């Protein structure tokens, strides 16, 4: 600043701490409903796809981890037919645990 | 396929439509002091065409 | 006993039911600039059985 | 039925933020959310009134 | 605190300043309506209570 | 730094609405019917790689 201010480079950056990045699997990136339109898009349904992903990150000078959440339904239905009996049925989909 | 999404409430009817109407009246009648809303899943589904 | 609670608006009808219907229409029609709501008691009563 | 491939702790942390105001401390559940001084994370160096 | 910390008694208390304590005369301690359930069960007495 | 924890006792507390017995019996009979099965879904529903 002032009459003797030194020639200067301008630097720009951002912070976004408590957040977790998101990419909705919806044709226009909007939350139109919890079961998305692309998740119903029966091309990429029954005739099953492989997925490849690549990330470019700032080098950290120490060992770190990518945390990747694949968002799916993780629902349980609980049936209590008789005194003292609990039958709970679980379906996570996609990424179902069983077969 | 939908038979399983319907049974598991990922798609299909809302809790106000699949529960027996006796239980829906019970819920509506007691909801200010005993709350049954958080125990039933309501699907929401995005439109697939147009 | 209820004859006294009813007359005094501790129990019984709501203001929207005990007031003459002519006044209820007047209130509904002027409520945004002259408010008559804070001048009439509305009972609220807990359920006594079940 | 629980899975190594699930994170209940983080799901609960995210749930409470949607259900209410995490800025209010409640001692019963030891609920008092982690934070940092926002003037310390990003230094706003406007000097001193000296 | 530190390696030379002294053996210690733990004291616990509360404050609750601007409040005034309440006990509802209702069978389950809830505000189901301003005329409570117990205030209607107890309406009639042979020897109205001390 | 030697921090440590001892648990002297662990107890399950539970709290019951003091429901009228005929209303509670009626509600149980409705909630046991398979039409009325309770259902829940994890908030962060996702696989965690």
């Amino acid at each position: 600043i002032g009459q003797t201010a030194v020639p200067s480079v301008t630097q720009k950056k951002f912070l976004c701490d408590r957040v977790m990045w998101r990419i909705p699997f919806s044709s226009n990136f909007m939350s139109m409903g919890a079961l998305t339109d692309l998740g119903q898009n029966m091309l990429y349904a029954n005739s099953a796809h492989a997925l490849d992903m690549t990330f470019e990150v700032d080098p950290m000078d120490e060992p770190t981890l990518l945390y990747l959440l694949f968002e799916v339904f993780d629902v349980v239905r609980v049936h209590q037919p008789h005194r003292g009996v609990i039958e709970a049925v679980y379906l996570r989909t996609p990424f179902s645990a069983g077969n | 396929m939908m038979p399983q999404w319907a049974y598991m409430h990922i798609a299909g009817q809302d809790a106000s439509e699949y529960l027996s109407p006796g239980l829906v009246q019970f819920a509506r009648a007691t909801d200010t002091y005993f709350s049954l809303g958080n125990k039933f899943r309501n699907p929401t589904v995005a439109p697939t065409h147009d | 006993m209820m004859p006294q609670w009813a007359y005094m608006h501790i129990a019984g009808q709501d203001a929207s039911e005990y007031l003459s219907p002519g006044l209820v229409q007047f209130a509904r029609a002027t409520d945004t600039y002259f408010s008559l709501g804070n001048k009439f008691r509305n009972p609220t009563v807990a359920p006594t059985h079940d | 039925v629980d899975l190594q491939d699930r994170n209940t702790e983080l799901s609960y942390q995210l749930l409470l933020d949607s259900l209410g105001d995490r800025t209010r401390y409640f001692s019963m559940w030891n609920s008092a959310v982690d934070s940092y001084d926002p003037d310390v994370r990003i230094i706003e160096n406007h000097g001193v009134e000296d | 605190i530190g390696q030379t910390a002294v053996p210690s008694v733990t004291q616990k208390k509360f404050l609750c300043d601007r409040v005034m304590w309440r006990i509802p005369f209702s069978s389950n301690f809830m505000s189901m309506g301003a005329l409570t359930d117990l205030g209607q069960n107890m309406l009639y007495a042979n020897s109205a209570h001390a | 730094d030697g921090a440590s924890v001892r648990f002297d006792s662990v107890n399950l507390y539970a709290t019951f609405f003091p429901m009228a017995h005929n209303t509670a019996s009626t509600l149980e009979a409705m909630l046991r019917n398979d039409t009325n099965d309770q259902s829940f879904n994890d908030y962060l529903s996702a696989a965690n790689m």
């Binding site: - | 009648a29 809303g37 039933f40 | 709501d14 079940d50 | - | - | -």
Partner: peptide, 25 residues
């Protein structure tokens, strides 16, 4: 990271007087 809201259509009071909290059959 999203829930899909459960529950019925919220409370209605069975107004014989102004709000009671009971009518069921």
């Amino acid at each position: 990271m999203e829930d899909i809201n459960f529950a019925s259509l919220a409370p209605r009071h069975g107004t014989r007087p102004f709000m009671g909290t009971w009518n069921e059959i």
